[PDB]
């Protein structure tokens, strides 16, 4: 199924996934499109933090729902 | 004395030039000594006389001196929730 | 309910959903207009195009067409975003 990954840069990313897939596989797909490693990636669904140990079905993430993308921001 | 720059060149923001206070917003980010005035000058830049400033503090010194911006954005607002 | 949970981002969205689901033009459009009230001054990722754009595109009718543009222009009143 398709989902939406909305950034805070006004940019919407679409990924073809399955409802039983883990979050880290989705972050691997984001790395496949972009080259950003998953430790630098954070995902938010309806104000809730996503953990890589669970699946999309565990958070009831379904076809073409909207995610949020915030990046790891460390300085110095 | 340099700390009455933000609130009292909102005086000078709209009539003279909207870039002029933005050139004075540049004068904020030049006098970077050190944190105490630096915190309080940009306290007002979020929810006290205008917003729309959260795109000018993601420069290459994002440790805490340019990581004030998110703390300006909602955390002191959360301290205003902690009120 | 927007005035009750004011200056909030933490659980203001969660309180709406227990009274959002009624399948009414007048209950959802009043509740989703209050969603722009809660994040007023937060301007983080709450719904730049998420919740009230999905409210707005339901329109063929009454306040779903109306009460969805008031909340985001309220929540992003301090914003100068073009998009």
Contact C71, C36 (CB under 8 A): yes
CA of C63, closest CA in chain A: separation in Å?
Answer: 24
Resolution (A): 3.0
Closest CA to A6 of C64, C65, C83: C83
Q: How many Cβ atoms sit within 10 Å of the Cβ of residue A52?
A: 14
Residues of B in contact with C79 (CB under 8 A): 51-52
Sign of CA dihedral B64, B67, B73, B78: negative
SS3 A23: helix
In this complex, is the C-beta atom of A10 within 8 Å of any C-beta atom belonging to chain C?
yes
- Interface touch B74/C42, C-beta < 8 Å: yes
- Long-range CB contacts for residues B38-44, cutoff 8 Å, separation at least 24: B38/B65, B38/B68, B39/B68, B40/B3, B41/B3, B41/B5, B41/B6, B42/B6, B42/B68, B42/B69, B42/B72, B43/B72, B43/B76, B44/B6, B44/B7
Q: Which CATH class is domain A1-76?
A: alpha beta
**Residues 6 or more apart in contact with residue C21 via CB below 8 angstroms:** none
Q: Where on the phi/psi map is residue C59: left (φ > 0), alpha (ψ -120 to 50), or beta?
A: beta
Task: List CB contacts (< 8 A) between B73 and chain A.
Answer: none
CA angle in degrees (0–180, nearest 5) for C71-C74-C76: 105
Cα–Cα dist B78/C17, whole Å: 23
Give the three-state DSSP class for B51.
coil
> How many Cβ atoms sit within 10 Å of the Cβ of residue B58?
14
Helix (H/G/I), strand (E/B), else coil: C6: coil
**Chain centroid, CA C63 distance in Å:** 13
Q: What letter would DSSP give residue A40?
A: G
The CA dihedral of B74, B80, B82, C2, to the nearest 10 degrees, is: -80
CB of B43 within 8 Å of a chain C CB? The answer is no
**DSSP reduced 3-state for C23:** coil
Strands A48-49 and A41-45 turn out to be antiparallel
Q: Provide the residue ranges of all domains of chain A, joining segments of one domain with +.
A: 1-76
> Is A44 an interface residue toward C (CB < 8 Å)?
yes
**Sign of the alpha-carbon torsion through C54, C56, C57, C63:** positive
For residue A57, the 8-state DSSP code is T
A contact chains, 3+ CB pairs < 8 A: B, C
Nearest-neighbour CA in chain A from B25: distance (Å): 22
Q: Which residues of C lie inside 8 Å of A (Cβ-Cβ)? A: 9, 13-14, 45-46, 48-50, 83
Distance from CA of B2 to the nearest CA of C (A): 25
**Å from A8 to nearest chain C CA?**
7
- Among chain B residues, CA nearest to A75: B63
Chain B CA closest to residue C81: B52
């Amino acid at each position: 199924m398709q989902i939406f990954v909305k950034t805070l840069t006004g940019k919407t990313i679409t990924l073809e996934v399955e409802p039983s897939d883990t979050i880290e596989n989705v972050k691997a797909k984001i790395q496949d499109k972009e080259g950003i490693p998953p430790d630098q990636q954070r995902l938010i669904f309806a104000g809730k933090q996503l953990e890589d140990g669970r699946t999309l079905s565990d958070y009831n993430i379904q076809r073409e729902s909207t995610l949020h993308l915030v990046l790891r921001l460390r300085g110095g | 004395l340099r700390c009455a720059l933000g609130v009292f060149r909102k005086f000078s923001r709209f009539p003279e030039a909207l870039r002029l206070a933005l050139m004075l917003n540049d004068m904020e980010l030049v006098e970077d000594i050190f944190t105490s005035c630096k915190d309080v000058v940009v306290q007002k830049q979020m929810a006290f006389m205008l917003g729309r400033h959260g795109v000018f503090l993601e420069l290459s010194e994002d440790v805490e001196e340019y990581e004030d911006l998110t703390e300006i954005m909602s955390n002191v607002q959360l301290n205003s929730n902690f009120l | 309910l927007g005035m009750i949970l004011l200056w909030d981002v933490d659980g203001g969205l969660t309180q709406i959903d227990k009274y959002l689901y009624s399948s009414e033009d007048y209950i959802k459009s009043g509740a989703l207009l209050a969603c722009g009230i809660v994040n007023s001054g937060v301007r983080n990722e709450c719904d730049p195009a998420l919740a009230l754009l999905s409210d707005y595109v339901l329109h063929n009718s009454n306040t779903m067409r109306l009460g969805s543009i008031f909340g985001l222009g309220l929540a992003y009143a301090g914003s100068n975003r073009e998009d």
